Amino acid sequence: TLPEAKDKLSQQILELFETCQQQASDLKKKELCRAQLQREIQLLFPQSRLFLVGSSLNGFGARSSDGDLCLVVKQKTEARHILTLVHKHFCTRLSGYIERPQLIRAKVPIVKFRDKVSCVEFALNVNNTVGIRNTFLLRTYAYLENRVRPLVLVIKKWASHHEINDASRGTLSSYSLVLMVLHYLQTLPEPILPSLQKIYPESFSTSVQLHLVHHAPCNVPPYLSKNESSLGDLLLGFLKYYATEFDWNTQMISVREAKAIPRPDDMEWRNKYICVEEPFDGTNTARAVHEKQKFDMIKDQFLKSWQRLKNKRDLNSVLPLRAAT
């Protein structure tokens, strides 16, 4: 299943999609690593399970997507004690096939490591279960329509190429972008995506047992929309929408509502530049964008890329196609 591709830009977007999309063999090496590590971690926490989460499973992965793992142990004092124990385990016992494990310090503490078996970089956290839930929310969107995945992928590569796709460095997280693409698709005049949580709350409710949340994409049917915009029309529109129309200073993006909502007067959103509502809990995913200079970098790059693309409808105007493939 693939979109139209009547023009050059749309064809280049599909070409980039098909050569960079995460292949089944990439996902098998990540799953073999996940199962081996769960087995390995269970020596320490026998009541624990290890989940693949994020780009590896949400449908928006590229061959270069790192792996995200979520360790479920039956509030943060425990989460940090477990993460440091797991880390010492990786350093002492697992050093034969687990390279350079490091505790990275962030809102969600992480153990970063490289699997020498798959040669793949991984990020493991402890008990951040919301990432399991939204993995399968996003996955259900990722396959709800054939344009969502090519658009999201070219947009991820685009943001990464322009050094605005790294929340650790002050810019937009991949999750923020994905939510922004999905919001753009949700609010078109003839919309390309509905709200999954409004139409089927039963398949994404917070009472669903974590180990069954992945059943949700098997339940939800595909979305047929009236919009006939091709991939190049939509990539241009997505750059224009955030470059010109979307008021960062007054509104927040709610994929849960499939709407733009006014910024709440709560203290979380009081001084933030960018407000994207996490769909399961109520928090700002773009909270990492807190420096004016970086905020401007995002704004200026949206404007500029929409300009170069408008004039020359070649994907090379905003993303060198030789630097990805």
Numbering used by the authors: 148 to 221, 231 to 481
Authors' account:
Germline development defective 2 (GLD-2) is among the first reported cytoplasmic non-canonical PAPs that promotes the translation of germline-specific mRNAs by extending their short poly(A) tails in metazoan, such as Caenorhabditis elegans and Xenopus. GLD-2 proteins from different species have various lengths, but share a conserved nucleotidyltransferase (NTase) region composed of a catalytic domain and a central domain. Different from C. elegans GLD-2, mammalian GLD-2 is an intrinsically robust PAP with an extensively positively charged surface. Whereas C. elegans GLD-2 prefers adenosine-rich RNA substrates, mammalian GLD-2 can work on RNA oligos with various sequences.
To understand the structural properties of the NTase region of mammalian GLD-2s, we determined crystal structures of rnGLD-2131-484 and mmGLD-2143-484 at resolution of 2.5 Å, and 2.7 Å with Rfree of 24.3% and 27.1%, respectively. Additionally, the two constructs also contain mutations at catalytic sites (D279A for rnGLD-2131-484 and D213A/D279A double mutations for mmGLD-2143-484), as the yield of wild-type proteins was too low for crystallization experiments. rnGLD-2 is composed of two domains, namely the catalytic domain (from residues 169 to 283) and the central domain (residues 147–168 and 284–480), and shows typical overall architecture of template independent nucleotidyltransferase. Residues 131–146 and residues 222–230 are disordered and not resolved in the structure. The cleft harbours the conserved catalytic residues Asp213 and Asp215 on β2, and Asp279 (substituted by an alanine in the structural model) on β5. Structural comparison with other PAPs containing wild-type catalytic residues indicated that mutation of Asp279 does not affect global or local folding of rnGLD-2. The rnGLD-2 structure we solved possesses a well-folded tip of the central domain where the four-stranded β-sheet is clearly discernable. In rnGLD-2, β9 stays closest to the active site, and the overall topology of the β6−β9 sheet is homologous to the yeast GLD-2-related protein Cid1. Electrostatic potential plot analysis suggests that rnGLD-2 possesses an extensively charged surface as compared to ceGLD-2.
